[PDB]
XYZ file of C-alpha atoms in Angstrom:
110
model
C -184.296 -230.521 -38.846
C -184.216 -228.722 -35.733
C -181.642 -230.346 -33.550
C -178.533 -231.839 -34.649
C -175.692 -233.656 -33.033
C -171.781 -233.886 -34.640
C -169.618 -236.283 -32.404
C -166.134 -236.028 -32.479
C -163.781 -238.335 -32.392
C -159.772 -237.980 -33.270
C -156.234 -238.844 -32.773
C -156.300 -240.428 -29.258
C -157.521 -237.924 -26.736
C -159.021 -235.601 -29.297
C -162.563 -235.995 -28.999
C -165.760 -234.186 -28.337
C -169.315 -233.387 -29.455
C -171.258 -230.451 -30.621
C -174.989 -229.506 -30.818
C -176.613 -227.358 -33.683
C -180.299 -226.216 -33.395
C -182.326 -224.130 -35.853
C -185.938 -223.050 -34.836
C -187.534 -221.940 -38.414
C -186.294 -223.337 -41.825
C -184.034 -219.735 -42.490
C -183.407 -218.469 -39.173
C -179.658 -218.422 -37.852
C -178.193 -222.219 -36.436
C -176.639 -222.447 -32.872
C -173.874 -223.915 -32.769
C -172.769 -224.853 -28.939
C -170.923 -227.718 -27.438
C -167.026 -228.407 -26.629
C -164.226 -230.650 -27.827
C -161.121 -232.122 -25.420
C -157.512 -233.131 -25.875
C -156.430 -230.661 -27.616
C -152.556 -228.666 -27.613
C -152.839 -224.775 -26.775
C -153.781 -221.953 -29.798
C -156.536 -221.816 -32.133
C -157.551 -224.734 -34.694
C -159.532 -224.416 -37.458
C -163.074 -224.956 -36.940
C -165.542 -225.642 -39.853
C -167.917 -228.136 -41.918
C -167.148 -230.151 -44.806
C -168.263 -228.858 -47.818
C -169.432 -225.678 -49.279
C -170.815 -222.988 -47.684
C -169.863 -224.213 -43.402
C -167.213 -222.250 -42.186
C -167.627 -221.350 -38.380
C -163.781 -219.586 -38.085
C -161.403 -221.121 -34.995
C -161.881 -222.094 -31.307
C -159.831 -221.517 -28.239
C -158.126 -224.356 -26.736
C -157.133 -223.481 -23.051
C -154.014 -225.060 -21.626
C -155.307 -227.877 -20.836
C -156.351 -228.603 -24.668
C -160.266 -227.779 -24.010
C -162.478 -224.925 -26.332
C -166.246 -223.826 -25.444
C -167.911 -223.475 -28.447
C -171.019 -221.083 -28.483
C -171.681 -219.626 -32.100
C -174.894 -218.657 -33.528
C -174.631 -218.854 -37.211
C -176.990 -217.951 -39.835
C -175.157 -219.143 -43.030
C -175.566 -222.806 -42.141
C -178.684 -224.299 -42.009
C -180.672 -227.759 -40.958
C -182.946 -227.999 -43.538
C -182.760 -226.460 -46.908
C -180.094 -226.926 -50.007
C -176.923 -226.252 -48.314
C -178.161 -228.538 -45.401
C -175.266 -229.402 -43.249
C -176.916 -232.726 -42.136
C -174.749 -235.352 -43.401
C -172.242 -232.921 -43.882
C -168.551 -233.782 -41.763
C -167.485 -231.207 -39.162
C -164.147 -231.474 -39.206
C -161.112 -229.771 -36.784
C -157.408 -229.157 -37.049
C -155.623 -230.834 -33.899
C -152.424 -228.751 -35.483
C -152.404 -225.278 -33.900
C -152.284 -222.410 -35.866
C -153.049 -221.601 -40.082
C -152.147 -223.234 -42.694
C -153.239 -226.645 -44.418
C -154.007 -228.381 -41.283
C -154.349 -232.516 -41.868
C -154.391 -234.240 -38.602
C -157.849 -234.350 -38.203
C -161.022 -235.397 -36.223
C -164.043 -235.392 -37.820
C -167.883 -236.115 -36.832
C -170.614 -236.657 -39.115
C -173.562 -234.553 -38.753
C -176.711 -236.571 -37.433
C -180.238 -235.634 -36.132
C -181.603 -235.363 -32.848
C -184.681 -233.777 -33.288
């Protein structure tokens, strides 16, 4: 694919929605987009499955992270294509085995 868009949707006001777009079929994914509700520190950010990993966001005080992350691991087309593939978030705060989650199946857009 070459656009991609994972909605989120969570424990009451967690929600949000997130964008990916890929140009060529092994160039790097951008990943941009925002998510709202949230408590303040850093959740864990990253898709379901192997190989999707995109590290942590920063949720403000008023429980809101910009997301802007190129990424040339993941990809839209290929073997290890993300599409289909759950973005999930942790709505707990810090590390650790997060399990309150919201999640957002990857669909296309383009």
């Amino acid at each position: 694919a070459t656009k991609a868009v994972a909605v989120l949707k969570g424990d009451g006001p967690v929600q949000g929605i997130i964008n990916f777009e890929q140009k060529e079929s092994n160039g790097p994914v951008k990943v941009w987009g925002s998510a709202k509700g949230l408590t303040e520190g850093l959740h864990g950010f990253h898709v379901h499955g192997a190989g999707g990993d995109l590290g942590n966001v920063t949720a403000d005080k008023d429980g809101v992270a910009d997301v802007s992350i190129e990424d040339s691991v993941i990809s839209l087309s290929g073997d290890h294509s993300i599409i289909g593939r759950t973005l999930v978030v942790h709505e707990k705060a810090g590390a650790g085995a997060g399990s309150r989650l919201a999640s957002g199946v990857i669909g296309i857009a383009q």
